[PDB]
Write a protein that binds this DNA or RNA. Structure first.
Ligand SMILES: [Mg+2]
Ligand SMILES: [Mg+2]
Ligand SMILES: [Mg+2]
Ligand SMILES: [Mg+2]
Ligand SMILES: [Mg+2]
Ligand SMILES: [Mg+2]
Ligand SMILES: [Mg+2]
Ligand SMILES: [Mg+2]
Ligand SMILES: [Mg+2]
Ligand SMILES: [Mg+2]
Ligand SMILES: [Mg+2]
Ligand SMILES: [Mg+2]
Ligand SMILES: [Mg+2]
Ligand SMILES: [Mg+2]
Ligand SMILES: [Mg+2]
Ligand SMILES: [Mg+2]
Ligand SMILES: [Mg+2]
Ligand SMILES: [Mg+2]
Ligand SMILES: [Mg+2]
Ligand SMILES: [Mg+2]
Ligand SMILES: [Mg+2]
Ligand SMILES: [Mg+2]
Ligand SMILES: [Mg+2]
Ligand SMILES: [Mg+2]
Ligand SMILES: [Mg+2]
Ligand SMILES: [Mg+2]
Ligand SMILES: [Mg+2]
Ligand SMILES: [Mg+2]
Ligand SMILES: [Mg+2]
Ligand SMILES: [Mg+2]
Ligand SMILES: [Mg+2]
Ligand SMILES: [Mg+2]
Ligand SMILES: [Mg+2]
Ligand SMILES: [Mg+2]
Ligand SMILES: [Mg+2]
Ligand SMILES: [Mg+2]
Ligand SMILES: [Mg+2]
Ligand SMILES: [Mg+2]
Ligand SMILES: [Mg+2]
Ligand SMILES: [Mg+2]
Ligand SMILES: [Mg+2]
Ligand SMILES: [Mg+2]
Ligand SMILES: [Mg+2]
Ligand SMILES: [Mg+2]
Ligand SMILES: [Mg+2]
Ligand SMILES: [Mg+2]
Ligand SMILES: [Mg+2]
Ligand SMILES: [Mg+2]
Ligand SMILES: [Mg+2]
Ligand SMILES: [Mg+2]
Ligand SMILES: [Mg+2]
Ligand SMILES: [Mg+2]
Ligand SMILES: [Mg+2]
Ligand SMILES: [Mg+2]
Ligand SMILES: [Mg+2]
Ligand SMILES: [Mg+2]
Ligand SMILES: [Mg+2]
Ligand SMILES: [Mg+2]
Ligand SMILES: [Mg+2]
Ligand SMILES: [Mg+2]
Ligand SMILES: [Mg+2]
Ligand SMILES: [Mg+2]
Ligand SMILES: [Mg+2]
Ligand SMILES: [Mg+2]
Ligand SMILES: [Mg+2]
Ligand SMILES: [Mg+2]
Ligand SMILES: [Mg+2]
Ligand SMILES: [Mg+2]
Ligand SMILES: [Mg+2]
Ligand SMILES: [Mg+2]
Ligand SMILES: [Mg+2]
Lengths: 53, 148, 222, 51, 156, 185
RNA sequence: GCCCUGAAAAUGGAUGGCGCUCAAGCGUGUUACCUAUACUCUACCGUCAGGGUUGAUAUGAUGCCCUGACGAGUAGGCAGG
RNA sequence: AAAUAUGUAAGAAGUCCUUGUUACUUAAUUGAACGUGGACAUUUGAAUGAAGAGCUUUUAGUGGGCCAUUUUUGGUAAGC
RNA sequence: GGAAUACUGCCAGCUGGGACUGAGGACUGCGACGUAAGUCAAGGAUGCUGGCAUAAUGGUUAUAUGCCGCCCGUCUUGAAACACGGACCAAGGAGUCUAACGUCUAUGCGAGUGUUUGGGUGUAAAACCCAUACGCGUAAUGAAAGUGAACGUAGGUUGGGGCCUCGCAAGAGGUGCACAAUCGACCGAUCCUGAUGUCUUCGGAUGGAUUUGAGUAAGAGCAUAGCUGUUGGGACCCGAAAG
RNA sequence: GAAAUUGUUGAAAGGGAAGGGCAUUUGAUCAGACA
């Protein structure tokens, strides 16, 4: 990570900064739009008691 | 004085600061140096290694005096001349007329070499010297004169 | 010696100058907030229109209230409650949600109530029970100069600036949020709504993530 | 020497936050949102009332 | 000495008061209190007496009268919180009242003017009362709570 | 309740006055807390505290330890300050001029310093000549040269010297101190 | 599922007692309400901490002044009285 | 082959360039260890917290314990 | 097709009833309202009115009433215990003094320190003065005979308050006592090496070694006094069977 | 000339102990402050 951190620091500086190279935790998810096309929702229900044996 | 003392402060409490359970009793671990090799050994080794057993030769009827021989280091040495006179000898450091210091007269038995005297010449009268003390004393143009 | 008015001149004009900056800044935020809400609303509406589902971003900010007293508490959750600054019953703090704090929240679910706070309740938390930490010494917010003196360095030179850094989880949420002494809340005024507090919200108890239902609780407590 | 709640106490309400005056002037707390009439795709309704 | 002697005494200088911020503003009365309105007195010398309300004096009190010739109560001050305001009104539009204020009752038997003022105010009121049957009788009978009466229910 | 994270009602641990009853000490302290409250010079803050220190925490500084310090590069014209007493040392023969400000100078110490045409100054005189401690070199003495600390940390393999009254062969030098007698330490 | 049988011990006797039967019982749901030395705000005591203040010509510089937080306790320690 | 528990790491005591010292070590100025000189500052290297952190001396009482959830041995069992 | 309503949420929308508090004591802040003059609810209550001026309010006390409240002391895991002591009251009644000590602190002096065995002197067990010794300290290490502390600016490295220099500042560099860590040098012991030499077996220079010391490396001690702690003493007080 | 303990006088309470806590009624008693 060090050896890499040096690089993107060079790649920034030389260019004209804006780096940000601390690690960060998993962030929560952003919004998103899920389409229904090819994928209408399947409705499930709970299933009755049964024995097999 | 009694007035500043914790026992004035313990008045009214039951156990005088000695505890209710353990109590204050006469001689719990035994008296004095009891227990040394048994229930007090951990304390004795640690804090007092060396304590039990013997080393070395007995000497019957030893007379300290026989071995009286105080040390003085070059360190000092010029201290054995009073200051008024000291400066007179420090400057005009020479043969022909160099100070005689009688280190036995001052009550020393051996001259040792802790460190650095000025280049001034001294005539040093003593019973014993350490090889270094003499070397150093000489490199300033002095001598040791062995007395008794 | 002038100063009489002569340096009361600088001061009053400069103070006047600041309220101006605060005035336009608070106008900005209110536009920022209300188009922020409207967009999400038209998001959902557009997505239905297209035959689709707009799934909101997951919440980035939670607000945690310690619901449990100080006795008989296992070590691991005890430490976490300390680090989240919840060391007495009914006090609360804000928390930026990342994987590394989720797991904190998880370890303390039986002792806390938390959820996603609305603008209204972050605003009324801070206007009412908001206190800075200043050379320790818990100091009430009450004047904007108190804020600018300790958070100015980060932009943030007023009370609604503070709120804004909180609710939008800004680049300086850590300094901003730590600045706020943990909030000391009362017991809920109309009560807890449940017979027994110490089971999960989902089982008719009070502890855990109750999501947006936190606003009703915290308002009743504030 | 006495913490005064804004929220109740217009004096310090306005001392903190000067937007309060125009906020209330223009009502703003009761903003009328633009009436728009977009309608949901059949798909959405169908699966809403699906068993 | 018997006792020693402190090494520090309080100064005996008394501080000025801080500059307090407490404007007196006018007491606005509850809507039911409108001159011409009949009041039930709830306490006092004339407790239970039904009486006509005339003016809101500068010390917040209410100027009322019996009228004296009806029920025995004179032009008089009464406190607005020891009064039940009924819903029945006599018009009070020919009753002078300008004269009557706090100093008029500066404590300082009965002065000929009070005696006289009482009659000038009452003849006008009596003129108006006659316009509604039984009102005089109403005004001359005391109010009292009867078995079963529940003030928090009753309309007055 | 509060789940306290740290001891309550804890005193800071630091002296705040000296334990001494000496008026003149208390006067110097009157002086230096003033200087410390009103000058933002760090020298004054350091000096204030040293005035509070107990005798152990202010070992004597010898006049030869002073001569050394003046041998630092660029330090010869500095005025050395010692918040304690200053002692003499016949082990140095040639002692420089300078100005030493201290709490006490032994007879032989002020002699040596004065014989070289230097100057002994009290701390208040120092205050007046240097309200911000300008051009000043503070020296402290050896604290851990004390005989007491010889014995701190006594225990196996620690090498720290017995609390012992008589010494000689035959005092605490056998079982436990040599390989041939039980074991060694 | 509830109820009933299966169900035997010693002074008279215990859903805490009275008593209760579409309960004042059992299962479940919804409101309201009562009240801890706990929580919120405030005053006052003390403890710890951080500030301010030698400028005389009046009285405590270990003083005075501002501010914040905190307070269970046997054995035991220390402190001020 | 889990879950819970558990070792280490997340930088200035860091990273890179140049090339000095030795009796060690290499076929070898090869290496190894310690260095000189030079280049890059706080998004300098995750989170949260921090009524600060480190350190020294000395000394009291104590050294019969018992209980609850969970794991769990002996015992038919036990308020064992 | 077009509305209404419920539900949930928001308003820096308005407004009524009730309760508790009113700390502070000139001014000083941040504001609000006004064209202004001024005003204000803006860094902690004022205005107006009445009653009494006294046992009225308040304190104390006895009793009554609501609710609550088991004998203390002790040892104990656990005591109100069907564990022990204690009928009652006065008065007595238990960590002390001494020898020698550890740590801490105050004070005097400081490479020293300590007048009080003794002498001198006296307003006579005091106070005042003092010569020679002695004790501890200023050297260590060896069983001992013995030997005995600078390669060097009394060393290098890293951190280091403070000071110094530059800079408006932030910062940069210089110096760095104490203290800490680390690598060396010095003295003794142990082991090895064994020069110039010699009453030919004495002598032991010199350079070394995963060895070793309560050491050196520009001294810190000595004395008096106090709290706490240590050992010997009847040893906090009272108690055997015994010898 | 204390206390334990006792006689008389005066006042009060007392349905198988007494004594105690928070609060107020009632009786008795009393300081202060008003001007
Ligand atoms: Mg003693
Ligand atoms: Mg005494
Ligand atoms: Mg005492
Ligand atoms: Mg005590
Ligand atoms: Mg105590
Ligand atoms: Mg006591
Ligand atoms: Mg105790
Ligand atoms: Mg004790
Ligand atoms: Mg006992
Ligand atoms: Mg022995
Ligand atoms: Mg020496
Ligand atoms: Mg539980
Ligand atoms: Mg957080
Ligand atoms: Mg409510
Ligand atoms: Mg309600
Ligand atoms: Mg309620
Ligand atoms: Mg329940
Ligand atoms: Mg509330
Ligand atoms: Mg349907
Ligand atoms: Mg005003
Ligand atoms: Mg009004
Ligand atoms: Mg009539
Ligand atoms: Mg030494
Ligand atoms: Mg039953
Ligand atoms: Mg029941
Ligand atoms: Mg039920
Ligand atoms: Mg109901
Ligand atoms: Mg309370
Ligand atoms: Mg409080
Ligand atoms: Mg306590
Ligand atoms: Mg772990
Ligand atoms: Mg761990
Ligand atoms: Mg923090
Ligand atoms: Mg801090
Ligand atoms: Mg201990
Ligand atoms: Mg112990
Ligand atoms: Mg022990
Ligand atoms: Mg035991
Ligand atoms: Mg438990
Ligand atoms: Mg007041
Ligand atoms: Mg006041
Ligand atoms: Mg009276
Ligand atoms: Mg009366
Ligand atoms: Mg009586
Ligand atoms: Mg009871
Ligand atoms: Mg017992
Ligand atoms: Mg038992
Ligand atoms: Mg008991
Ligand atoms: Mg029993
Ligand atoms: Mg017994
Ligand atoms: Mg008995
Ligand atoms: Mg007695
Ligand atoms: Mg004399
Ligand atoms: Mg005599
Ligand atoms: Mg003689
Ligand atoms: Mg020897
Ligand atoms: Mg030999
Ligand atoms: Mg090195
Ligand atoms: Mg530097
Ligand atoms: Mg350097
Ligand atoms: Mg050696
Ligand atoms: Mg050896
Ligand atoms: Mg020794
Ligand atoms: Mg020694
Ligand atoms: Mg003893
Ligand atoms: Mg016997
Ligand atoms: Mg016998
Ligand atoms: Mg025998
Ligand atoms: Mg008699
Ligand atoms: Mg009583
Ligand atoms: Mg009472």
């Amino acid at each position: 990570r060090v050896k890499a951190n040096a690089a993107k620091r060079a790649e920034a500086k030389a260019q004209g900064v804006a780096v940000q190279l601390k690690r960060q935790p998993a962030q929560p998810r952003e919004s998103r739009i899920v389409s229904t096309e090819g994928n209408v929702p399947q409705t499930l229900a709970p299933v009755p008691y049964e024995t097999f044996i | 004085p009694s007035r500043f003392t914790k026992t004035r402060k313990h008045r009214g409490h039951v156990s005088a600061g000695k505890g209710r359970i353990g109590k204050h009793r006469k001689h719990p671990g035994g008296r004095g140096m009891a227990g040394g090799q048994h229930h007090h050994r951990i304390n004795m080794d640690k804090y007092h290694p060396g304590y039990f057993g013997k080393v070395g030769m007995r000497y019957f009827h030893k007379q300290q005096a026989h071995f009286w021989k105080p040390v003085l280091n070059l360190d000092k040495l010029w201290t054995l001349i009073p200051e008024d006179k000291r400066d007179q000898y420090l400057k005009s450091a020479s043969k022909e007329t160099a100070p005689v210091i009688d280190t036995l007269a001052a009550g020393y038995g051996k001259i040792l070499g802790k460190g650095r005297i000025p280049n001034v010449p001294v005539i040093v009268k003593a019973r014993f010297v350490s090889k270094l003390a003499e070397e150093k004393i000489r490199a300033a143009g002095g001598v040791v004169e062995l007395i008794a | 010696a002038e100063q009489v008015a002569a340096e009361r001149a600088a001061r009053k004009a400069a103070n006047k100058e600041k309220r101006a900056i605060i005035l336009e800044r608070n106008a900005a935020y209110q536009k920022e907030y209300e188009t922020a809400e409207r967009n999400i609303i038209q998001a959902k509406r557009d997505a239905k229109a297209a035959g689709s589902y707009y799934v909101e971003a997951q919440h980035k900010l939670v607000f945690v209230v310690r619901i449990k007293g100080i006795n008989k508490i296992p070590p691991k959750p005890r430490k976490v409650l300390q680090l989240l600054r919840l060391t007495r019953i009914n006090s609360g703090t804000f928390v930026k949600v990342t994987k590394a704090t989720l797991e904190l929240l998880k370890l303390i679910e039986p002792y806390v109530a938390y959820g996603y706070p609305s603008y209204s309740t972050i605003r009324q938390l801070v206007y009412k029970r908001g206190f800075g930490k200043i050379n320790k010494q818990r100091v009430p917010l009450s004047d904007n100069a108190i804020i600018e003196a300790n958070l100015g360095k980060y932009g943030i030179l007023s009370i609604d600036d503070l709120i804004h850094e909180i609710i939008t989880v800004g680049p300086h949420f850590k300094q901003a949020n730590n600045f706020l002494w943990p909030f000391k809340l009362s017991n809920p005024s109309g009560g807890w709504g449940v017979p027994r507090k110490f089971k999960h919200f989902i089982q008719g108890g009070s502890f855990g993530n109750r999501e947006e239902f936190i606003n009703k609780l915290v308002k009743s407590m504030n | 020497v006495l913490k005064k709640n804004p929220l109740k106490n217009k004096q310090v309400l306005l001392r903190l936050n000067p937007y309060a005056k125009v906020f209330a002037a223009e009502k703003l707390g009761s903003k009328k949102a633009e009436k728009t009439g977009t309608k949901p795709a059949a798909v959405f309704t169908e699966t809403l009332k699906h068993d | 000495s018997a006792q020693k002697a402190p090494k520090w005494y309080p100064s005996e200088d008394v501080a000025a008061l801080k500059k307090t911020r407490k404007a007196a503003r006018p007491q606005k009365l509850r809507a039911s209190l409108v001159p011409g309105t009949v009041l039930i007195l709830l306490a006092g010398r004339f407790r239970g007496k039904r009486v006509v309300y005339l003016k809101h004096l500068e010390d917040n009190t209410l100027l009322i009268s019996g009228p004296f010739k009806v029920n025995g109560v004179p032009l008089r001050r009464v406190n607005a919180r020891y009064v039940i305001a009924t819903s029945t009104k006599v018009s009070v539009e020919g009753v002078n009242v300008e004269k009557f204020n706090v100093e008029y009752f500066a404590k300082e038997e009965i002065k000929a003017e009070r005696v006289e003022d009482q009659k000038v105010v009452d003849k006008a009121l009596i003129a108006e009362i006659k316009k509604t049957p039984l009102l005089k009788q109403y005004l001359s009978a005391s109010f009292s709570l009867k078995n079963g009466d529940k003030p928090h229910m009753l309309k007055f | 309740g509060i789940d306290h994270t740290s001891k309550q009602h804890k005193r800071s641990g630091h002296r705040t006055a000296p334990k001494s009853d000496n008026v003149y000490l208390k006067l110097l302290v009157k002086l230096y807390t003033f200087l410390a409250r009103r000058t933002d010079a760090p020298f004054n803050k350091v000096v204030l505290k040293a005035l509070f220190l107990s005798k152990i925490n202010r070992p004597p500084v010898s006049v030869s330890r002073i001569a050394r310090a003046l041998k630092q590069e660029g330090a010869a014209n500095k005025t050395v300050v010692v918040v304690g007493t200053v002692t003499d040392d016949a082990r140095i023969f040639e002692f420089p001029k300078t100005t030493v400000a201290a709490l006490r100078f032994t007879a032989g110490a002020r002699a040596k310093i004065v014989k070289a045409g230097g100057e002994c100054i009290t701390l208040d005189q120092l205050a007046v000549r240097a309200p911000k401690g300008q051009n000043t070199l503070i020296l402290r003495g050896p604290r851990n040269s004390r005989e007491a600390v010889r014995h701190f940390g006594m225990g196996p393999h620690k090498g720290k010297a017995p609390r012992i009254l008589s010494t000689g062969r035959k005092f605490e030098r056998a079982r436990g101190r040599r390989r041939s007698k039980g074991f060694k330490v």
